[PDB]
Amino acid sequence: MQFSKMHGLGNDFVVVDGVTQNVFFTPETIRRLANRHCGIGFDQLLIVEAPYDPELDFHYRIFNADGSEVSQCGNGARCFARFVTLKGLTNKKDISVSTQKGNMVLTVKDMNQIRVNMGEPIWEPAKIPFTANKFEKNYILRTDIQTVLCGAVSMGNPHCVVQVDDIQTANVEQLGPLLESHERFPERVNAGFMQIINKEHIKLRVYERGAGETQACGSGACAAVAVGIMQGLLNNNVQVDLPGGSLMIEWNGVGHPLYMTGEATHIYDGFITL
């Protein structure tokens, strides 16, 4: 079985062409391959599978180094785009791929960058879901250690954004878990902590629900910029500085989809029996 190693936003992946290969991994296998000393070594592994829908071009499923089939933050979306074109699985500049959570449209820019369409951010409280009387630009959340102000959005997963004085000293370790599993969030939520530098530049740290703080969470970057733009604190087209890397977020208000631009680098190709 042949594969290709790539990386983006501090995370290195192992992409596999499951469209022409009948591959199938089990938690064990993945955990074994994910081993940096006895395996291929990688943070995540995604498989390019055929979409059983004439509407979509491809379908893919990311995997945690643990072997669990994750599905959040739209990770490896650019790696999938770059891989799919490099190996010549398509020739279209615009690709419609689906994941465990809905789907998205990616476009390969001439700048070799990959622009992703995350659709329009959902604000309806009950549609996030988030228990709130009505929509507010600033919801008051109360935690055991303190009451905070935040914004709630939705790309497909629930998102809670909190502004901080300094990204490095943000009590993410304590507050993150507090917000992640809050009662006002029926299905938990992704707690994002962002620090505003300019009206077009912000630093952020996300605490993925059921996972915790990771290298980078695409979705989190989108949500952060959304509330920022809705709050009128950020301009359209904002750069997001995540621990793993940077991202170019674009959005022109309600009635417009939210675009997320980033890049993926191909390192090498490999072959492994079984």
CSV table of C-alpha atoms in Angstrom, one decimal:
chain,number,residue,atom,x,y,z
A,1,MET,CA,0.0,0.0,0.0
A,2,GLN,CA,1.4,3.4,-1.0
A,3,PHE,CA,0.9,6.6,0.9
A,4,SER,CA,2.1,10.2,1.0
A,5,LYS,CA,3.3,12.2,4.0
A,6,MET,CA,2.3,15.9,4.2
A,7,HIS,CA,2.0,18.6,6.9
A,8,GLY,CA,0.1,21.7,7.8
A,9,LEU,CA,-0.3,24.0,10.8
A,10,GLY,CA,2.2,22.0,12.8
A,11,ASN,CA,0.4,18.7,12.1
A,12,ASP,CA,1.9,16.1,9.9
A,13,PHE,CA,-0.5,13.7,8.1
A,14,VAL,CA,-0.3,10.4,6.2
A,15,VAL,CA,-2.7,10.6,3.3
A,16,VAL,CA,-3.8,7.4,1.6
A,17,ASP,CA,-5.6,7.0,-1.8
A,18,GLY,CA,-8.5,4.8,-0.8
A,19,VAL,CA,-10.2,5.4,-4.1
A,20,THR,CA,-8.0,2.9,-5.9
A,21,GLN,CA,-7.0,0.9,-2.9
A,22,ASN,CA,-9.3,-1.3,-0.7
A,23,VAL,CA,-7.5,-0.1,2.5
A,24,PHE,CA,-9.0,-0.5,5.9
A,25,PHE,CA,-7.3,0.3,9.2
A,26,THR,CA,-8.3,-0.7,12.8
A,27,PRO,CA,-7.5,1.3,15.9
A,28,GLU,CA,-4.5,-1.0,16.5
A,29,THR,CA,-3.1,-0.7,13.0
A,30,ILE,CA,-3.4,3.1,13.1
A,31,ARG,CA,-1.8,3.3,16.5
A,32,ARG,CA,1.0,1.1,15.3
A,33,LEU,CA,1.6,3.1,12.1
A,34,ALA,CA,1.3,6.4,14.1
A,35,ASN,CA,4.3,5.2,16.2
A,36,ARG,CA,7.2,7.6,15.5
A,37,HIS,CA,9.7,4.9,16.3
A,38,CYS,CA,8.3,1.6,15.0
A,39,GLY,CA,5.8,3.0,12.5
A,40,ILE,CA,5.5,5.7,9.8
A,41,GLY,CA,4.9,8.2,12.5
A,42,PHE,CA,2.2,10.9,12.2
A,43,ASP,CA,-0.2,13.1,14.1
A,44,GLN,CA,-3.2,12.1,12.0
A,45,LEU,CA,-4.0,9.9,9.0
A,46,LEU,CA,-6.7,10.6,6.5
A,47,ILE,CA,-8.1,8.3,3.8
A,48,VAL,CA,-9.4,9.6,0.4
A,49,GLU,CA,-12.5,7.5,-0.2
A,50,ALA,CA,-15.0,7.5,-3.1
A,51,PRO,CA,-18.2,9.5,-2.4
A,52,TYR,CA,-21.3,7.5,-3.0
A,53,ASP,CA,-23.1,10.6,-4.3
A,54,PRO,CA,-22.8,11.9,-7.9
A,55,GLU,CA,-23.0,15.4,-6.4
A,56,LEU,CA,-19.7,15.2,-4.5
A,57,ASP,CA,-16.3,14.6,-6.0
A,58,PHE,CA,-14.6,13.0,-3.0
A,59,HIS,CA,-15.1,12.0,0.6
A,60,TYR,CA,-12.5,11.6,3.4
A,61,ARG,CA,-12.1,10.5,7.0
A,62,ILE,CA,-9.4,11.8,9.3
A,63,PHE,CA,-8.0,9.5,12.1
A,64,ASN,CA,-6.5,10.3,15.4
A,65,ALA,CA,-3.1,8.8,16.3
A,66,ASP,CA,-5.2,6.9,18.8
A,67,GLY,CA,-7.1,5.2,16.1
A,68,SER,CA,-10.4,6.9,16.7
A,69,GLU,CA,-12.1,8.3,13.6
A,70,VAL,CA,-12.3,12.0,14.4
A,71,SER,CA,-14.3,14.6,12.5
A,72,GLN,CA,-13.9,18.2,13.6
A,73,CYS,CA,-11.9,21.4,12.9
A,74,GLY,CA,-11.8,20.5,9.2
A,75,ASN,CA,-8.3,19.2,9.7
A,76,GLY,CA,-6.2,18.1,6.7
A,77,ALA,CA,-8.7,19.7,4.3
A,78,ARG,CA,-5.9,21.4,2.4
A,79,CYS,CA,-3.7,18.4,2.6
A,80,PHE,CA,-6.6,16.4,1.0
A,81,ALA,CA,-6.9,19.0,-1.7
A,82,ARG,CA,-3.2,19.2,-2.4
A,83,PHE,CA,-2.9,15.4,-2.4
A,84,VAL,CA,-5.9,14.8,-4.6
A,85,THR,CA,-4.5,17.1,-7.3
A,86,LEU,CA,-0.8,16.1,-7.0
A,87,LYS,CA,-1.6,12.5,-7.5
A,88,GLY,CA,-3.9,13.5,-10.4
A,89,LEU,CA,-7.2,12.1,-9.0
A,90,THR,CA,-8.9,15.2,-10.5
A,91,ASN,CA,-8.2,18.2,-12.6
A,92,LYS,CA,-10.9,20.5,-11.3
A,93,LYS,CA,-9.9,23.7,-9.4
A,94,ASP,CA,-13.0,23.4,-7.3
A,95,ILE,CA,-13.6,20.2,-5.4
A,96,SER,CA,-16.7,19.2,-3.4
A,97,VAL,CA,-15.7,16.8,-0.6
A,98,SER,CA,-17.8,15.4,2.3
A,99,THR,CA,-16.8,14.4,5.8
A,100,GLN,CA,-18.4,12.7,8.8
A,101,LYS,CA,-19.9,16.1,9.4
A,102,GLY,CA,-21.5,17.5,6.3
A,103,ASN,CA,-19.3,18.6,3.4
A,104,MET,CA,-17.3,21.5,2.0
A,105,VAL,CA,-16.0,23.0,-1.3
A,106,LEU,CA,-12.2,23.5,-1.7
A,107,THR,CA,-10.5,25.6,-4.4
A,108,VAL,CA,-6.8,25.3,-5.3
A,109,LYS,CA,-5.5,28.8,-5.8
A,110,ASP,CA,-2.7,29.5,-8.3
A,111,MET,CA,-0.7,30.6,-5.3
A,112,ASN,CA,-0.7,26.9,-4.5
A,113,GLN,CA,-2.8,27.8,-1.5
A,114,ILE,CA,-6.1,26.0,-0.7
A,115,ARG,CA,-9.2,28.1,-0.1
A,116,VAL,CA,-12.0,26.3,1.8
A,117,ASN,CA,-15.7,27.2,1.9
A,118,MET,CA,-17.0,26.5,5.4
A,119,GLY,CA,-20.5,27.7,4.5
A,120,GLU,CA,-22.4,30.3,6.5
A,121,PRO,CA,-21.9,30.5,10.3
A,122,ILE,CA,-25.2,29.7,12.2
A,123,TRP,CA,-26.1,32.2,14.9
A,124,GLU,CA,-29.5,30.9,16.0
A,125,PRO,CA,-28.9,29.9,19.7
A,126,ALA,CA,-31.2,26.8,19.6
A,127,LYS,CA,-29.5,25.9,16.3
A,128,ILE,CA,-26.0,25.7,17.7
A,129,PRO,CA,-27.2,24.4,20.1
A,130,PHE,CA,-26.9,26.9,22.9
A,131,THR,CA,-29.5,27.5,25.6
A,132,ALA,CA,-30.2,31.3,25.5
A,133,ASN,CA,-33.4,33.4,25.6
A,134,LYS,CA,-32.4,35.2,22.4
A,135,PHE,CA,-29.4,35.9,20.2
A,136,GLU,CA,-26.8,38.2,21.7
A,137,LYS,CA,-23.4,39.5,20.5
A,138,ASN,CA,-22.1,38.9,24.0
A,139,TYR,CA,-23.5,36.1,26.1
A,140,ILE,CA,-22.7,36.0,29.9
A,141,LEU,CA,-21.4,32.6,30.8
A,142,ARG,CA,-20.9,31.7,34.5
A,143,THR,CA,-18.2,29.2,35.6
A,144,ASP,CA,-17.2,28.0,39.1
A,145,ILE,CA,-14.0,30.1,38.9
A,146,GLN,CA,-15.6,33.2,37.2
A,147,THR,CA,-18.3,34.6,34.9
A,148,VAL,CA,-17.2,35.4,31.4
A,149,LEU,CA,-18.4,37.0,28.2
A,150,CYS,CA,-18.4,35.1,24.9
A,151,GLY,CA,-19.9,34.6,21.5
A,152,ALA,CA,-21.5,31.4,20.2
A,153,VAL,CA,-21.5,30.3,16.6
A,154,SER,CA,-21.7,27.2,14.5
A,155,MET,CA,-19.9,25.9,11.4
A,156,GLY,CA,-21.2,22.4,11.9
A,157,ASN,CA,-20.0,22.0,15.4
A,158,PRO,CA,-20.7,24.4,18.4
A,159,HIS,CA,-18.2,27.2,19.1
A,160,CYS,CA,-17.7,29.5,22.0
A,161,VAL,CA,-15.3,32.4,21.7
A,162,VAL,CA,-13.7,34.3,24.5
A,163,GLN,CA,-11.4,37.4,24.2
A,164,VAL,CA,-8.3,37.6,26.3
A,165,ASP,CA,-5.7,40.2,27.3
A,166,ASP,CA,-2.8,37.9,26.4
A,167,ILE,CA,-3.0,34.5,24.5
A,168,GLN,CA,0.0,33.1,26.5
A,169,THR,CA,-1.5,33.8,29.9
A,170,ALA,CA,-5.1,32.9,29.0
A,171,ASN,CA,-6.4,30.5,31.7
A,172,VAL,CA,-7.3,27.9,29.0
A,173,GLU,CA,-6.3,25.0,31.2
A,174,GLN,CA,-8.9,25.9,33.8
A,175,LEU,CA,-11.5,27.8,31.9
A,176,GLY,CA,-11.4,25.7,28.8
A,177,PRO,CA,-12.7,22.5,30.5
A,178,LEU,CA,-15.2,24.6,32.4
A,179,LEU,CA,-16.6,26.1,29.1
A,180,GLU,CA,-16.2,22.9,27.1
A,181,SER,CA,-18.6,20.9,29.3
A,182,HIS,CA,-21.0,23.7,30.3
A,183,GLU,CA,-24.7,23.0,31.1
A,184,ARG,CA,-25.8,25.8,28.7
A,185,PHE,CA,-24.3,23.7,25.9
A,186,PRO,CA,-26.4,20.6,25.4
A,187,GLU,CA,-23.8,19.0,23.2
A,188,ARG,CA,-20.7,20.5,24.8
A,189,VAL,CA,-18.7,23.0,22.8
A,190,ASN,CA,-15.3,24.1,21.4
A,191,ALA,CA,-13.9,26.8,23.7
A,192,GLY,CA,-11.7,29.2,21.7
A,193,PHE,CA,-9.5,31.9,23.3
A,194,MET,CA,-8.5,34.8,21.1
A,195,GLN,CA,-6.4,37.9,21.6
A,196,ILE,CA,-7.0,40.8,19.2
A,197,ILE,CA,-3.9,42.5,17.9
A,198,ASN,CA,-5.3,44.5,14.9
A,199,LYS,CA,-8.6,44.6,13.1
A,200,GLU,CA,-7.1,42.1,10.7
A,201,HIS,CA,-4.8,40.1,12.9
A,202,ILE,CA,-5.6,37.9,15.9
A,203,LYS,CA,-3.9,35.1,17.9
A,204,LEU,CA,-6.0,32.2,19.2
A,205,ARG,CA,-6.0,28.9,21.2
A,206,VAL,CA,-8.9,26.4,20.9
A,207,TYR,CA,-9.9,23.8,23.4
A,208,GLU,CA,-11.6,21.1,21.3
A,209,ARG,CA,-14.4,19.4,23.1
A,210,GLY,CA,-13.7,15.8,24.1
A,211,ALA,CA,-10.1,16.4,23.0
A,212,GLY,CA,-8.6,19.5,24.7
A,213,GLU,CA,-6.1,22.0,23.4
A,214,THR,CA,-4.5,20.8,20.1
A,215,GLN,CA,-2.0,22.3,17.6
A,216,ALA,CA,-4.6,23.9,15.3
A,217,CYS,CA,-8.3,23.8,14.8
A,218,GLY,CA,-9.5,25.2,11.5
A,219,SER,CA,-13.2,25.5,12.6
A,220,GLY,CA,-12.1,27.4,15.7
A,221,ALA,CA,-10.3,30.0,13.6
A,222,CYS,CA,-13.4,30.5,11.5
A,223,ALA,CA,-15.7,30.9,14.5
A,224,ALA,CA,-13.3,33.3,16.2
A,225,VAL,CA,-13.2,35.6,13.2
A,226,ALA,CA,-17.0,35.3,12.8
A,227,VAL,CA,-17.9,36.6,16.3
A,228,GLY,CA,-15.1,39.2,15.8
A,229,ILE,CA,-16.6,40.5,12.6
A,230,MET,CA,-20.2,40.3,14.0
A,231,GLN,CA,-19.0,42.1,17.2
A,232,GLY,CA,-17.5,44.7,14.9
A,233,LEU,CA,-14.1,44.2,16.4
A,234,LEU,CA,-12.6,42.7,13.3
A,235,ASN,CA,-12.6,43.6,9.6
A,236,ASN,CA,-13.2,41.2,6.8
A,237,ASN,CA,-10.2,39.1,5.8
A,238,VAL,CA,-8.4,38.4,9.1
A,239,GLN,CA,-5.2,36.4,9.8
A,240,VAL,CA,-5.4,33.9,12.6
A,241,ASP,CA,-2.2,32.9,14.4
A,242,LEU,CA,-2.7,29.5,15.9
A,243,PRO,CA,0.0,27.5,17.8
A,244,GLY,CA,0.5,25.2,14.8
A,245,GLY,CA,0.5,27.9,12.1
A,246,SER,CA,-1.4,30.8,10.5
A,247,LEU,CA,-4.6,31.0,8.5
A,248,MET,CA,-6.3,33.5,6.3
A,249,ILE,CA,-10.0,33.8,7.2
A,250,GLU,CA,-12.4,35.7,4.9
A,251,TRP,CA,-16.0,36.6,5.4
A,252,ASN,CA,-18.2,39.4,4.2
A,253,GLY,CA,-21.1,39.4,6.7
A,254,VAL,CA,-24.3,37.5,6.9
A,255,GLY,CA,-25.6,36.0,3.6
A,256,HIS,CA,-22.1,35.1,2.7
A,257,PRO,CA,-20.2,31.9,3.1
A,258,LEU,CA,-17.0,31.9,5.3
A,259,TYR,CA,-13.7,31.1,3.5
A,260,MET,CA,-10.6,29.7,5.2
A,261,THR,CA,-7.3,29.8,3.3
A,262,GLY,CA,-4.2,27.9,4.3
A,263,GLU,CA,-1.5,25.7,2.7
A,264,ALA,CA,-0.4,22.1,2.8
A,265,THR,CA,3.1,20.8,2.0
A,266,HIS,CA,3.9,17.4,0.5
A,267,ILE,CA,7.0,15.8,2.0
A,268,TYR,CA,7.4,12.4,0.4
A,269,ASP,CA,5.7,9.2,-0.9
A,270,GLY,CA,6.1,5.7,0.7
A,271,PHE,CA,5.1,2.1,0.3
A,272,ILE,CA,4.3,-0.3,3.2
A,273,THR,CA,3.2,-3.9,3.0
A,274,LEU,CA,0.1,-4.5,5.1
